[PDB]
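Repro case for the chain-ordering regression, as requested:
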Amino acid sequence: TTGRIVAVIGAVVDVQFDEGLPPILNALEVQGRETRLVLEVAQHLGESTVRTIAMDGTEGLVRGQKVLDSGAPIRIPVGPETLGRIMNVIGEPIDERGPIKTKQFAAIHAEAPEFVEMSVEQEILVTGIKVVDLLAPYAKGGKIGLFGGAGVGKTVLIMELINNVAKAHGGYSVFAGVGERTREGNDLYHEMIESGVINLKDATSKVALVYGQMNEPPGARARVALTGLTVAEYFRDQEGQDVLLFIDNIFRFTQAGSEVSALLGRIPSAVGYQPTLATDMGTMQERITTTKKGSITSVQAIYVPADDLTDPAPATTFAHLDATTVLSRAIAELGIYPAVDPLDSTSRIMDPNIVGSEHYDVARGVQKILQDYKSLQDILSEEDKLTVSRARKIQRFLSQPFQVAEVFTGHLGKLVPLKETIKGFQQILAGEYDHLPEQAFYMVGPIEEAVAKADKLA
Amino acid sequence: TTGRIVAVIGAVVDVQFDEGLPPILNALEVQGRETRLVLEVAQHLGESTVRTIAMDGTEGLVRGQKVLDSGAPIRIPVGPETLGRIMNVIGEPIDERGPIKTKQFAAIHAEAPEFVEMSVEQEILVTGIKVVDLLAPYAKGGKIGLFGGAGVGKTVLIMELINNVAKAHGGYSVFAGVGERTREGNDLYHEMIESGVINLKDATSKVALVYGQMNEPPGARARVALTGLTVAEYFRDQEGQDVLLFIDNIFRFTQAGSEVSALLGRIPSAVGYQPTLATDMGTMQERITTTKKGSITSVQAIYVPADDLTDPAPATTFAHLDATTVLSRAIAELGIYPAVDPLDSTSRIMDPNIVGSEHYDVARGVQKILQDYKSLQDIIAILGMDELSEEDKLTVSRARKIQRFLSQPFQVAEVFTGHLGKLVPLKETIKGFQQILAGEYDHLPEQAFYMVGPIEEAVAKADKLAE
Amino acid sequence: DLEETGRVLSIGDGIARVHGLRNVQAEEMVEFSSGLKGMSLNLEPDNVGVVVFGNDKLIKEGDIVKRTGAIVDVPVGEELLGRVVDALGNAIDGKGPIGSKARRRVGLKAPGIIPRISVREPMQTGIKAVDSLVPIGRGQRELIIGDRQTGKTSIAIDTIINQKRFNDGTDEKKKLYCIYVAIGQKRSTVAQLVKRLTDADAMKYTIVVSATASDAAPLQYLAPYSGCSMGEYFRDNGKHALIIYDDLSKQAVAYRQMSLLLRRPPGREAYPGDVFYLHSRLLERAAKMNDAFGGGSLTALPVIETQAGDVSAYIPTNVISITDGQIFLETELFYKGIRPAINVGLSVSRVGSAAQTRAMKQVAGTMKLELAQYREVAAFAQFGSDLDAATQQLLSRGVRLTELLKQGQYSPMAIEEQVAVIYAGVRGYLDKLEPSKITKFENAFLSHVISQHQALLGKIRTDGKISEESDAKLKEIVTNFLAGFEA
Ligand SMILES: Nc1ncnc2c1ncn2[C@@H]1O[C@H](COP(=O)(O)OP(=O)(O)NP(=O)(O)O)[C@@H](O)[C@H]1O
Ligand SMILES: Nc1ncnc2c1ncn2[C@@H]1O[C@H](COP(=O)(O)OP(=O)(O)NP(=O)(O)O)[C@@H](O)[C@H]1O
Ligand SMILES: [Mg+2]
Ligand SMILES: [Mg+2]
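-- result from build under test --
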């Protein structure tokens, strides 16, 4: 049925309906406008009136203006045709390339998979990136906190992850820019085109882009992660894939939720966050998981307010994380790429029961030697001098050329299988390459390339 | 036109009018009162009802009591005959010397001078106070603010400024007592009669006094600053001549507003303040200004609640100033008076192009040595002075002497210090700090520098402390 | 006619609640009987909450309020250059009417993803610390942030003054038109500001939009957007504009006043839930356009005032997150003698090298690393008399480079002059010189190379780097000059 606007207060719009009231979460379409204005039902106020949150600016709205109940929550194009495209929170193309011509659409509000659908399988998602796989491996259906941002090669790591997962698992990616700076959204898109992870000329794109930009109202920025989630859910639940979902960044998800809660007049909780902080987080996060059909695995850029790890926002988020990838400027200034901190990055599935016994020991060994190296940096005996030379060559072997960096660096990128990663670091820990130089281990793939680089330095 | 009181809660009085509703800011007169009770219109509530703020106590008011619209905002006497007199918020004499025999009056609400009316001239006003003249000098016709928590020295400083600058001033002065101690008003009044600045028998008085102290309800405290500045505005625009305006304490204007804010039906902003704190302040402060027509050198004492300079009241006040003198309990507690923070006081004219490079260099040098010492203090409190290089411990000893040479006995503070007051010429201030920085007194004891006037007295004190 | 008009139900604290006006649009400007304007921010079932653009003494219960087909726009164009205007583009400098032929809405959407290209053209401040270590390009949004009196406005003023050389030049491309938005300041401060720019001969390419402390809250709320629209005229016509918002802390306070008085729900620090949206809408309108859209740009330098150094307060947090980078200023740095008081360690520009010329890029990379290395060790500079030569050299070099980032006011530098000074520090020529004499050295050194060695400076800019021959000539000038200076 058709309702009428009765109140406009900023990004909050009240609509009165004579017949059937739209349920909470339903998308309403404002009539008589240039571009599509969507309102999401938030509350039933009584007296046939609903409170709604606007997805775009509310300037120019008049009391009595007509509003159509769409009969469902926000519904967006899902399918292969989203790949390489950029949509907004309401599923519109924003890349000026025409309609996203999918054969299916899907509601952005969906319940998390039921208990019976849970896969008790604790499986590693191989990224083909040496630091990640060995020392802080990704778990299928898990969430990974990505720390850092500027000058530490975040976007290149993202694109290589997109590349590697598609190449090795046949799984696609979704990038959700939550509070995306428009300049950086433009940059990312063009960097993806140049790296080849988006193709504008054929159907071989590996990522669907979903942007909720910073200049959009609280409602839009709060829901855009769910839009990304819904695109990802299609590839898992319809095509049985192991899907990657990027959320950049998870704090601005929480921030937009807080803004929305404030606008709806809800009393703020500790530190000014929404009272629904945990439930807002949980209903989104729980959709990221392994099910019987496949999985969605999620890399989530985390901003930490006031560098306070006990702040309610990061504290609530951490409850959902299974791993961390810590990108460090200190590692970058040593020339090691990717600039992953091999000591700070952790993974719950670094457990002898889950990963190999070989995996666990080699990782624990590499962890111990790099720790011992920093301890022996202050101060050596024959046993100590042997471990210092081994750990330095292990520092270099954690570096790796990326396929995504091939056009810029000129050097060939390497995707390293799990077992090749493990054996390479293992053999250094056993000292099979103590006879070989130090800089022969810098920027190679499998350990055989390090042997090949050592021959070239003769 | 006539109204009737419909509600009374503290200082907030609601009045209903059957016919012509009085505009916001209008003064209303309560009928059947022993002394004049003014209500100022603050809001139109609807239903022919206005919300008002009382200028005096509301005890004895009854629902139904008659109220007359005066047809204008509060209007007060202005002109020459205010000089030597004491007035209250509504312009009544409170010195028991009979009527203010003026035939010129002015509304206490007025528009601020426009952008085109601004003057950019800025020349130093020497105070003879070492810390001020050296580091953060005052400007003639400029806006001066004295910040401080309770009991740290704002009033003592303003009284010393009155002593050093106002007593020999060739134009007119206005002192506005806003939400402060009545005892201080009486002290000041009799001091000015003694100094001849106020004369009770002839027409030579140079100071106009306006008071609404902390015994008054918030309405009086909210408006008395406007009353005082309206007097000053007359002297600026109609006499033209150079005006000095002292306000103690301008915070009390904002505080009075916070006292009534909830009863005016407002959601609070942060720290209990009225949402309108900044615009209220702006409309008042922008009138306190030199213009092309005339100069006002304004000195405003600015209270700092809970010693927190981030408190919305003082925080919002900074932008309205050309020179800031910030006092500190942490400094006062050491016996360093005046308790000026050398690392938190600034001035527009602290510029090498204005004060000359020698003045600027010594002031920046002083601030550097003091900031360097402050950053070391806590490290050497644990690791010990002995760990420092002879270079670092040289700057520690020097900084501690500079801290002490910044202290000064005030003429108005003799009853607190036990020392005779000292006024130090700018040249001597500059020279003294220059010499200490250059290491010219590295051989002298720290204490020789404490609580003296010129540098020669430190030298003289060094001999006296020997035997 | 309660569809196109209404009546005041109540008026107080700059809020008129109006009965009727049934056909008013959200955010539409309406007119009171007195002539005062108001913006319709709250459309409610039984009233319109109207914010008052003026003194509410002139509004009474029962007053008629009318729709007028009003559009909240401002004059735009080259005729505003050299002019001081209010929040609505009215001349307040007394020099008569703006000769405006074009106008633009104050509330417009930013360009989206597609019309933009990556920021790549230097926006030169002439301030060594910024241009070398926190580089700004055209289209960037770079925050200037710090406590009261830490030197925030001065960064902006030097930046504006710096554009004179490009603007007096013939390279129509390097030219940058400037807009200074003053919000909540006192009128005499703004007058001092304009005097400074006039004396610098900077006014002729600058527009001053001013909504001062006694201007009503909605006027202060609008001023940034008005300034922005004026900037956008240049951006969309293939030209380049720089806008300064001094400051956004004061604009947020004005908006909070209105929001609270409209009884919108208060959040942290009593700010409304849409306060981020307030600044993000504004700051996204600064952009770099691709060639298909004319290739113009709008660069924004918002200013934020922190309280007792709290960069994690609500409004600072918002603008920090929105912008492409931040210049952090600190009081202890200021009084230690670090002026401009930039904390280089914390300050950031995500655009980075892309905004730097080859000449700057060849010296800034080294300075960045040597200072970064110095920062790890600086804690024991007055306590490391015994440690080995390597960490002694880090301190010696780092303390010297720190002095070279100090700069006086009102004299922004050409890039060639900047790199010539940074060259002397990074190649080690000043490693033996007493740290406290470096500022005095640079003043005299720069005056010497400008006065006599204009061929050398020209060559540095001609080549776009310091060549071997330029390196040789610089080594002889510096080493001989230093010997004479430390006598
Ligand atoms: N210059 C000074 N020399 C010596 N003692 C001083 C000086 N200034 C202040 N004191 C001492 O501290 C007391 C408080 O100073 P005063 O100027 O009255 O404080 P204030 O900052 O105005 N406080 P308040 O009015 O309560 O906000 C004085 O009565 C003296 O005892
Ligand atoms: N590079 C510099 N060298 C020396 N002095 C400076 C420099 N930059 C600023 N100053 C001085 O420092 C003082 C404060 O600078 P200003 O640019 O007003 O800072 P601000 O943070 O904008 N102040 P406010 O807005 O009043 O809180 C002024 O007196 C300047 O003249
Ligand atoms: Mg006092
Ligand atoms: Mg400033």
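Ordering looks correct now. The CA atoms of residues 2 and 68 of chain B lie 5 Å apart.
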